[PDB]
């Protein structure tokens, strides 16, 4: 809980970003989440709207807008859940959190992957770097903490780094009750067409930090469990160093040791969810499948099939045609 | 003893080496030197004369520095130091004096006078340099 | 972050205004029978002295620290100042109203005076016994009884009362003695004060911790803090030619085009609506905390370069950290002199340590060139003490405080050298840029005014004898922003509010205040420590707390080590007197206490010979003797320490006489009987079967065949045949006559914290400010 | 503790490129009694490493 | 007792330390580039303070080699051995600047246990020893010229 790493992150930063962070949240809202289909009136009529930024708008007109106080999110008023299927894996869930906590983590996770984009340890923000930068710096060690970062045991540390570390001090502040509200969050999961209400102590994405904030704690892992550091780095559910039965025994012991899930593997080559270098050479996957979407979008007819044909030209550029 | 040696060469190379022109180059490792005595000095106070017909005079040290700062030295740089070494002159003569009549048997050779017993001292080696005479 | 430092900064008040009531006292007298040699309860029943809590430990050890915790109770209570009209009590007796000392003092009159005592003289005595005033003096008379030991505190806490005086004239001196002088600001005042002013001074002596020798990772922290501190001040500018208009003849002035870039990335400079202030700012607290800066720059940005001109002719240069004096220099040197006054040949070529700007000194040849780099190269601090008290300031050469010929020189030397040159074009972009300085070189002369008076205003305002080191987490500064505001000012004029600059002396003040003050506390504390000899409270304790109480400072977030080091150099350091002189009270009479008062004794002899025992007032007659004279001993401290060497195992088993020292717990019995069957002999056994002692309860006798149902005995005739008795010595009696003491101190008092906040500080009209060279400061239009 | 203080010390990333190789320090809670452990049975058992 | 020992200097008169550390005092100077002697004396002083409690240290293994050792039968020759033992200058880093105020030893019936194994250790190798011998010899003098 190294996860220091927020605060050089946004150590230099009385920014202006900082001081109008507020405003910043504000006007992302178009590349914001999403949020409960509440119900709205606006003028003389009724509406459906699941976007968050239109919430912003009810609120504001209804003097109900109050983003200094950021919702609990707990029994009193639990998290709705979305999810993310992927073929080959157990389903992960989506939190639903109000339009206060996009607002009170884009100027602060903005301004941390700044600080990402010129360190080459986080190999998916670096520059305009492309997955062929990422392939030929593999001078070697390959994980997947997949489900580490889904570790009730990970929510305590990486909750307390992040706010450990943490118009400004509003800013900073707010960011940090964020994470306090989260440390104990309930979820509305449903159980049939009934809509059940368990407790939930690990992590899950939906926040502005989620991407920014993981990688953090990932990085940070694999330099814990870290018998000459040539290149270490991070990428989603992966993180990798180059620095074998024996070292990887310890390896896996010491990732044991501290209680998480994870395939720690040691080798000329290295896999991992986005690609993989067999025989030094860089290899992607094929696999999206071209007559089953995962979820009913709002596309349509036409543009399901410019769609079709997209992902028939990556399969085909990747290996499966 | 050693000390007082470089209280001179300190002037001679000094009275010397600093006048209307000079370029600062010459004087840089000379400067500092120099300098380094005013501050070990400054506080101190010495008892000169005493017997014959000898004056007694008292010194007090309370002087600044040098403005390293110029370049080509302006004639205002020489007449502002030379004005601070016309009392150093004045005072080694009647610290010379002072201790070339003093004579002893068993200790002979070592110092003697209130000037100089309190020269030997420890915090003040810090002065000596060019010993080529 | 930022904000984080300075609210835990600003949210300092050490000015607490400490203070008492209750006289302190530790012994009330209280009554028991007398027993008159032969052991007869006589009556009426005398007088002596035990104390309000027998606390006492069991082991030499516990006592010693025991007795330290009350000196932390004695600072945490020590009382700032004394007055006595808010101690008033009355009595029941006298010639008339009495008004007395303290509570306690009023019970036990009342109480004696009841209980049939030595009479006339103290009935008496408690009569004619009052108070008055000899109010011309403004002096206090009233009457107290305590205990010699008492009088003996409560004393000195009148000699001593940190309170001075407080007249129109302090207040006016505790302005610095170089602001009240400073002409453009003006003092005011609304009331005249009282005769019966006081004023705490907050003390403020000199980093009796010389903090920066090896310990940089605590000095970085002050910095920083000193640093953000003087942002919070550094004046916000004003009014300066709108961004746009300015950076728009800019691109004039130059002649651009159409993929045909020269001095193009010269712009990105502009936001200065910001990047002034900032650089601004960042400056001066720069140089009053006395913080090192990094530099990050392009090198295709050749104007940024120029400005550093600017700077650099200013900030002695080791203001800066060596790392980046380097580049900048060598990156002028190398794209900027050379390269347009056919001066190439080599592009320079270096290699690191040695001066690589000092080395272009004695290079090439040009006067006006030729002066920059001497006044620039040998340019540092001024080394300045005194400043109407030990300031320790640094200062900025006299040369340069506005008496800008620098900048006029340094300007002239621009002029001059846009003659030569060698790659055909790049003259062209790079003179322009140069050209940019020279024009607004009438408003340039001015920034360097500016800084000159306020780094040299704020100053004074500073007792943390700042001075000149490497920082480490260096601030950060671009030279875009440098650029910036050099070439967008000028007809503007700005300065220091007055509020401002108070709040800045208010809080150094107080920091120092707790600093010097938590030392004393420190100190005190190690010394009185050492003359206890508790080779076991690990001191890793005291610091702890220490730095704690100077907030800022992540105390779990640093090391063990520093940490010793700190206190090797506090060992090193007197007291003050206040602290000091009390210890000497509590030890000198250590003895007194400890011996009287019961739950303990001292120790006990083992005489295989039966003897008498002393026939004392208080007791009947027991097993005691206040000398031990003779037979060998053996500290029972030093002993469970060394782990008993059976000397006393032997001892015990082969019946030899002998005594033992330090604390005891004594055990009280009656029956007669228990004597004659000489039962005290028994208890040692236990030892020989346990190494260690403290199930050690030592027998004692309090024996008068009145109380003792057993008299039988006291009948025939007869003399205490005990073998074994008891160190300790006996509770002195109580001479009320004598026992009184008389008290002084003063009336209707008058405490002020703060100060200052009595002053309507108003200020000149900016258009017209001075320097220390009554100069109009911004004058060119 | 000790190893934050040592970055204000350290000036851990200063240019370098070959960070992090310093630092698997860690485990010193442990390191610490395996190198002493170590060195005396080292000593003792008249071995050479 | 053939069990090599060391400097009463080194034992508790420590100092060596004192005068290593002295000696890091003085090595603060010029070269190369600036990155460098910052971070390098930066982490020697690190040395110094601790110095202090380095100290310690010296006392420390001072007493335990020269106590453990006692109790040990089997004399010991110095010899090079085959085997290596690997030690990572991490930890040693390690203990260094992180000790404090700490002070362990050997329990008492650590120490015996000690004793008693080189012992029956010793014991079994002595008489073994005589069971071989005395089989050997008999097995000559009975010209049973086999095994």
Same mark, same amino acid.
């Given at each position: 809980?190294?996860?220091?790493?927020?605060?050089?992150?946004?150590?230099?930063?009385?920014?202006?970003?900082?001081?109008?962070?507020?405003?910043?949240?504000?006007?992302?809202?178009?590349?914001?989440?999403?949020?409960?289909?509440?119900?709205?009136?606006?003028?003389?009529?009724?509406?459906?709207?699941?976007?968050?930024?239109?919430?912003?708008?009810?609120?504001?007109? &209804?003097?109900?807008?109050?983003?200094?106080?950021?919702?609990?999110?707990?029994?009193?008023?639990?998290?709705?859940?979305?999810?993310?299927?992927?073929?080959?894996?157990?389903?992960?869930?989506?939190?639903?959190?109000?339009?206060?906590?996009?607002?009170?983590?884009?100027?602060?996770?903005?301004?941390?992957?700044?600080?990402?984009?010129?360190?080459?340890?986080?190999?998916?923000?670096?520059?305009?770097?492309?997955?062929?930068?990422?392939?030929?710096?593999?001078?070697?060690?390959?994980?997947?903490?997949?489900?580490?970062?889904?570790?009730?045991?990970?929510?305590?540390?990486?909750? !307390?780094?992040?706010?450990?570390?943490?118009?400004?001090?509003?800013?900073?502040?707010?960011? !940090?009750?964020?994470?306090?509200?989260?440390?104990?969050?309930?979820?509305?999961?449903?159980?049939?067409?009934?809509?059940?209400?368990?407790?939930?102590?690990?992590?899950?994405?939906?926040?502005?930090?989620?991407?920014?904030?993981?990688?953090?704690?990932?990085?940070?892992?694999?330099?814990?469990?870290?018998?000459?550091?040539?290149?270490?780095?991070?990428?989603?559910?992966?993180?990798?160093?180059? $620095?074998?039965?024996?070292?990887?025994?310890?390896?896996?012991?010491?990732?044991?040791?501290?209680?998480?899930?994870?395939?720690?593997?040691?080798?000329?080559?290295?896999?991992?969810?986005?690609?993989?270098?067999?025989?030094? !050479?860089?290899?992607?996957?094929?696999?999206?499948?071209?007559?089953?979407?995962?979820?009913?979008?709002?596309?349509?007819?036409?543009?399901?099939?410019?769609?079709?044909?997209?992902?028939?030209?990556?399969?085909?550029?990747?290996?499966?045609? | 003893?050693?000390?007082?040696?470089?209280?001179?060469?300190?002037?001679?190379?000094?009275?010397?080496?600093?006048?209307?022109?000079?370029?600062?180059?010459?004087?840089?490792?000379?400067?500092?030197?120099?300098?380094?005595?005013?501050?070990?000095?400054?506080?101190?106070?010495?008892?000169?004369?005493?017997?014959?017909?000898?004056?007694?005079?008292?010194?007090?040290?309370?002087?600044?520095?040098?403005?390293?700062?110029?370049? &080509?030295?302006?004639?205002?740089?020489?007449?502002?130091?030379?004005?601070?070494?016309?009392?150093?002159?004045? +005072?080694?003569?009647?610290?010379?004096?002072?201790?070339?009549?003093?004579?002893?048997?068993?200790?002979?050779?070592?110092?003697?006078?209130?000037?100089?017993?309190?020269?030997? /001292?420890?915090?003040?080696?810090?002065?000596?340099?060019?010993?080529?005479? | 972050?930022?904000?984080?430092?300075?609210?835990?900064?600003?949210?300092?008040?050490?000015?607490?205004?400490?203070?008492?009531?209750?006289?302190?006292?530790?012994?009330?007298?209280?009554?028991?029978?007398?027993?008159?040699?032969? /052991?007869?309860?006589?009556?009426?029943?005398?007088?002596?002295?035990?104390?309000?809590?027998?606390?006492?430990?069991?082991?030499?050890?516990?006592?010693?620290?025991?007795?330290?915790?009350?000196?932390?109770?004695?600072?945490?209570?020590?009382?700032?100042?004394?007055?006595?009209?808010?101690?008033?009590?009355?009595? !029941?007796?006298?010639?008339?109203?009495?008004?007395?000392?303290?509570?306690?003092?009023?019970?036990?009159?009342?109480?004696?005076?009841?209980?049939?005592?030595?009479?006339?003289?103290?009935?008496?005595?408690?009569?004619?016994?009052?108070?008055?005033?000899?109010?011309?003096?403004?002096?206090?008379?009233?009457?107290?009884?305590?205990?010699?030991?008492?009088?003996?505190?409560?004393?000195?806490?009148?000699?001593?009362?940190?309170?001075?005086?407080?007249?129109?004239?302090?207040?006016?001196?505790?302005?610095?003695?170089?602001?009240?002088?400073?002409?453009?600001?003006?003092?005011?005042?609304?009331?005249?004060?009282?005769?019966?002013?006081?004023?705490?001074?907050?003390?403020?002596?000199?980093?009796?911790?010389?903090?920066?020798?090896?310990?940089?990772?605590?000095?970085?922290?002050?910095?920083?803090?000193?640093?953000?501190?003087?942002?919070?001040?550094?004046?916000?500018?004003?009014?300066?030619?709108?961004?746009?208009?300015?950076?728009?003849?800019?691109?004039?002035?130059?002649?651009?085009?159409?993929?045909?870039?020269?001095?193009?990335?010269?712009?990105?400079?502009?936001?200065?609506?910001?990047?002034?202030?900032?650089?601004?700012?960042?400056?001066?607290?720069?140089?009053?905390?006395?913080?090192?800066?990094?530099?990050? +720059?392009?090198?295709?940005?050749?104007?940024?370069?120029?400005?550093?001109?600017?700077?650099?002719?200013?900030?002695?240069?080791?203001?800066?950290?060596?790392?980046?004096?380097?580049?900048?220099?060598?990156?002028?040197?190398?794209?900027?002199?050379?390269?347009?006054?056919?001066?190439?040949?080599?592009?320079?070529?270096? /290699?690191?340590?040695?001066?690589?700007?000092?080395?272009?000194?004695?290079?090439?040849?040009?006067?006006?060139?030729?002066?920059?780099?001497?006044?620039?190269?040998?340019?540092? +601090?001024?080394?300045?003490?005194?400043?109407?008290?030990?300031?320790?300031?640094?200062?900025?050469?006299?040369?340069?405080?506005?008496?800008? &010929?620098?900048?006029?020189?340094?300007?002239?030397?621009?002029?001059?050298?846009?003659?030569?040159?060698?790659?055909?074009?790049?003259?062209?972009?790079?003179?322009? /840029?140069?050209?940019?300085?020279?024009?607004?070189?009438?408003?340039?002369?001015?920034?360097?005014?500016?800084?000159?008076?306020?780094?040299?205003?704020?100053?004074?305002?500073?007792?943390?004898?700042?001075?000149?080191?490497?920082?480490?987490?260096?601030?950060?500064?671009?030279?875009?922003?440098?650029?910036?505001?050099?070439?967008?000012?000028?007809?503007?004029?700005?300065?220091?509010?007055?509020?401002?600059?108070?709040?800045?002396?208010?809080?150094?003040?107080?920091?120092?205040?707790?600093?010097?003050?938590?030392?004393?506390?420190?100190?005190?504390?190690?010394?009185?420590?050492?003359?206890?000899?508790?080779?076991?409270?690990?001191?890793?304790?005291?610091?702890?707390? +220490?730095?704690?109480?100077?907030?800022?400072?992540?105390?779990?977030?640093?090391?063990?080590?520093?940490?010793?080091?700190?206190?090797?150099?506090?060992?090193?350091?007197?007291?003050?007197?206040?602290?000091?002189?009390?210890?000497?009270?509590?030890?000198?009479?250590?003895?007194?206490?400890?011996?009287?008062?019961?739950?303990?004794?001292?120790?006990?002899?083992?005489?295989?010979?039966?003897?008498?025992?002393?026939?004392?007032?208080?007791?009947?007659?027991?097993?005691?003797?206040?000398?031990?004279?003779?037979?060998?001993?053996?500290?029972?401290?030093?002993?469970?320490?060394?782990?008993?060497?059976?000397?006393?195992?032997?001892? $015990?088993?082969?019946?030899?006489?002998?005594?033992?020292?330090?604390?005891?717990?004594?055990?009280?019995?009656?029956?007669?009987?228990?004597?004659?069957?000489?039962?005290?002999?028994?208890?040692?056994?236990?030892?020989?079967?346990?190494?260690?002692?403290?199930?050690?309860?030592?027998?004692?006798?309090?024996?008068?065949?009145?109380?003792?149902?057993?008299?039988?005995?006291?009948?025939?005739?007869?003399?205490?045949?005990?073998?074994?008795?008891?160190?300790?010595?006996?509770?002195?009696?109580?001479?009320?006559?004598?026992?009184?003491?008389?008290?002084?101190? &003063?009336?209707?008092?008058?405490?002020?914290?703060?100060?200052?906040?009595?002053?309507?500080?108003?200020?000149?009209?900016?258009?017209?400010?001075?320097?220390?060279?009554?100069?109009?400061?911004?004058?060119?239009?």
């Amino acid at each position: 809980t190294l996860i220091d790493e927020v605060v050089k992150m946004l150590e230099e930063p009385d920014d202006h970003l900082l001081r109008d962070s507020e405003l910043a949240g504000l006007l992302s809202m178009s590349s914001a989440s999403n949020g409960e289909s509440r119900q709205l009136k606006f003028g003389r009529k009724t509406i459906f709207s699941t976007k968050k930024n239109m919430h912003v708008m009810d609120d504001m007109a &209804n003097e109900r807008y109050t983003p200094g106080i950021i919702p609990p999110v707990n029994v009193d008023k639990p998290i709705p859940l979305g999810r993310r299927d992927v073929p080959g894996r157990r389903t992960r869930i989506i939190f639903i959190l109000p339009y206060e906590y996009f607002i009170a983590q884009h100027a602060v996770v903005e301004k941390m992957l700044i600080y990402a984009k010129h360190t080459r340890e986080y190999a998916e923000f670096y520059s305009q770097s492309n997955q062929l930068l990422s392939y030929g710096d593999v001078f070697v060690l390959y994980t997947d903490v997949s489900q580490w970062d889904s570790s009730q045991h990970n929510t305590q540390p990486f909750r !307390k780094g992040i706010i450990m570390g943490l118009k400004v001090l509003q800013t900073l502040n707010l960011y !940090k009750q964020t994470q306090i509200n989260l440390m104990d969050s309930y979820v509305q999961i449903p159980d049939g067409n009934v809509i059940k209400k368990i407790q939930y102590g690990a992590v899950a994405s939906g926040e502005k930090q989620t991407k920014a904030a993981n990688s953090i704690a990932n990085l940070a892992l694999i330099k814990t469990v870290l018998h000459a550091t040539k290149i270490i780095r991070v990428d989603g559910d992966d993180n990798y160093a180059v $620095l074998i039965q024996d070292v990887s025994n310890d390896v896996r012991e010491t990732y044991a040791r501290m209680n998480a899930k994870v395939k720690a593997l040691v080798s000329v080559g290295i896999e991992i969810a986005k690609r993989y270098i067999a025989g030094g !050479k860089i290899f992607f996957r094929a696999g999206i499948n071209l007559l089953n979407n995962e979820k009913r979008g709002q596309s349509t007819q036409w543009d399901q099939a410019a769609i079709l044909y997209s992902n028939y030209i990556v399969n085909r550029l990747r290996g499966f045609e | 003893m050693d000390v007082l040696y470089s209280l001179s060469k300190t002037l001679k190379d000094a009275r010397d080496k600093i006048v209307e022109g000079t370029l600062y180059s010459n004087v840089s490792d000379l400067i500092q030197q120099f300098n380094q005595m005013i501050i070990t000095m400054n506080g101190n106070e010495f008892q000169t004369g005493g017997i014959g017909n000898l004056p007694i005079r008292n010194w007090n040290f309370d002087f600044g520095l040098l403005g390293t700062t110029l370049l &080509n030295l302006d004639a205002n740089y020489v007449e502002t130091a030379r004005n601070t070494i016309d009392y150093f002159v004045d +005072f080694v003569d009647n610290v010379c004096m002072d201790e070339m009549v003093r004579e002893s048997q068993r200790n002979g050779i070592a110092p003697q006078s209130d000037s100089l017993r309190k020269l030997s /001292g420890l915090k003040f080696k810090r002065i000596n340099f060019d010993n080529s005479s | 972050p930022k904000e984080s430092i300075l609210k835990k900064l600003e949210d300092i008040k050490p000015e607490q205004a400490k203070k008492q009531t209750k006289l302190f006292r530790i012994f009330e007298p209280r009554q028991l029978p007398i027993y008159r040699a032969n /052991g007869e309860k006589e009556l009426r029943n005398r007088w002596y002295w035990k104390l309000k809590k027998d606390t006492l430990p069991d082991g030499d050890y516990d006592v010693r620290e025991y007795f330290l915790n009350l000196y932390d109770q004695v600072l945490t209570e020590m009382p700032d100042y004394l007055l006595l009209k808010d101690m008033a009590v009355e009595n !029941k007796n006298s010639r008339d109203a009495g008004k007395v000392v303290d509570s306690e003092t009023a019970s036990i009159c009342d109480a004696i005076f009841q209980d049939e005592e030595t009479e006339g003289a103290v009935r008496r005595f408690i009569a004619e016994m009052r108070q008055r005033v000899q109010a011309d003096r403004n002096v206090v008379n009233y009457p107290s009884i305590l205990h010699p030991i008492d009088y003996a505190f409560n004393e000195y806490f009148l000699q001593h009362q940190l309170v001075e005086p407080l007249n129109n004239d302090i207040i006016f001196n505790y302005i610095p003695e170089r602001i009240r002088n400073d002409v453009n600001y003006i003092l005011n005042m609304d009331r005249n004060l009282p005769s019966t002013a006081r004023y705490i001074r907050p003390n403020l002596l000199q980093d009796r911790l010389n903090l920066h020798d090896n310990f940089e990772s605590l000095w970085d922290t002050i910095t920083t803090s000193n640093y953000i501190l003087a942002r919070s001040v550094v004046p916000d500018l004003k009014e300066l030619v709108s961004t746009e208009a300015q950076i728009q003849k800019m691109s004039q002035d130059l002649q651009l085009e159409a993929l045909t870039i020269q001095s193009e990335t010269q712009f990105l400079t502009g936001i200065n609506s910001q990047a002034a202030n900032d650089c601004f700012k960042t400056l001066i607290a720069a140089m009053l905390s006395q913080r090192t800066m990094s530099l990050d +720059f392009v090198t295709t940005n050749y104007m940024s370069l120029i400005s550093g001109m600017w700077l650099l002719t200013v900030v002695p240069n080791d203001m800066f950290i060596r790392e980046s004096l380097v580049a900048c220099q060598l990156a002028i040197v190398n794209t900027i002199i050379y390269p347009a006054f056919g001066m190439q040949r080599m592009h320079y070529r270096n /290699g690191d340590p040695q001066t690589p700007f000092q080395i272009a000194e004695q290079q090439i040849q040009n006067f006006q060139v030729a002066n920059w780099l001497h006044f620039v190269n040998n340019n540092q +601090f001024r080394q300045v003490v005194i400043d109407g008290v030990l300031n320790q300031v640094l200062n900025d050469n006299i040369r340069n405080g506005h008496v800008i &010929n620098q900048l006029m020189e340094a300007l002239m030397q621009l002029s001059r050298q846009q003659f030569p040159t060698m790659p055909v074009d790049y003259k062209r972009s790079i003179q322009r /840029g140069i050209l940019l300085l020279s024009n607004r070189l009438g408003q340039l002369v001015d920034l360097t005014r500016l800084l000159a008076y306020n780094y040299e205003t704020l100053m004074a305002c500073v007792t943390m004898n700042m001075q000149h080191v490497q920082t480490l987490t260096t601030e950060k500064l671009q030279l875009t922003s440098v650029t910036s505001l050099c070439m967008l000012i000028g007809n503007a004029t700005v300065i220091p509010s007055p509020q401002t600059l108070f709040h800045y002396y208010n809080v150094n003040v107080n920091f120092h205040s707790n600093y010097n003050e938590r030392i004393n506390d420190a100190v005190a504390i190690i010394t009185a420590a050492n003359r206890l000899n508790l080779y076991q409270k690990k001191m890793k304790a005291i610091v702890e707390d +220490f730095l704690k109480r100077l907030h800022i400072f992540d105390v779990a977030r640093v090391p063990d080590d520093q940490m010793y080091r700190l206190r090797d150099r506090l060992r090193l350091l007197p007291v003050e007197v206040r602290r000091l002189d009390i210890f000497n009270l509590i030890l000198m009479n250590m003895d007194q206490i400890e011996r009287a008062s019961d739950k303990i004794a001292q120790g006990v002899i083992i005489a295989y010979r039966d003897m008498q025992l002393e026939r004392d007032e208080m007791y009947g007659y027991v097993n005691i003797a206040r000398n031990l004279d003779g037979f060998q001993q053996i500290n029972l401290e030093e002993l469970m320490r060394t782990g008993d060497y059976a000397q006393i195992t032997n001892m $015990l088993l082969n019946n030899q006489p002998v005594a033992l020292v330090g604390a005891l717990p004594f055990v009280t019995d009656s029956s007669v009987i228990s004597l004659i069957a000489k039962l005290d002999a028994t208890v040692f056994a236990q030892i020989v079967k346990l190494r260690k002692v403290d199930t050690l309860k030592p027998i004692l006798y309090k024996i008068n065949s009145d109380s003792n149902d057993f008299y039988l005995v006291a009948n025939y005739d007869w003399v205490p045949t005990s073998t074994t008795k008891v160190y300790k010595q006996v509770p002195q009696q109580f001479d009320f006559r004598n026992s009184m003491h008389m008290l002084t101190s &003063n009336l209707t008092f008058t405490v002020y914290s703060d100060l200052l906040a009595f002053v309507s500080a108003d200020t000149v009209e900016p258009i017209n400010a001075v320097a220390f060279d009554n100069m109009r400061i911004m004058n060119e239009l």
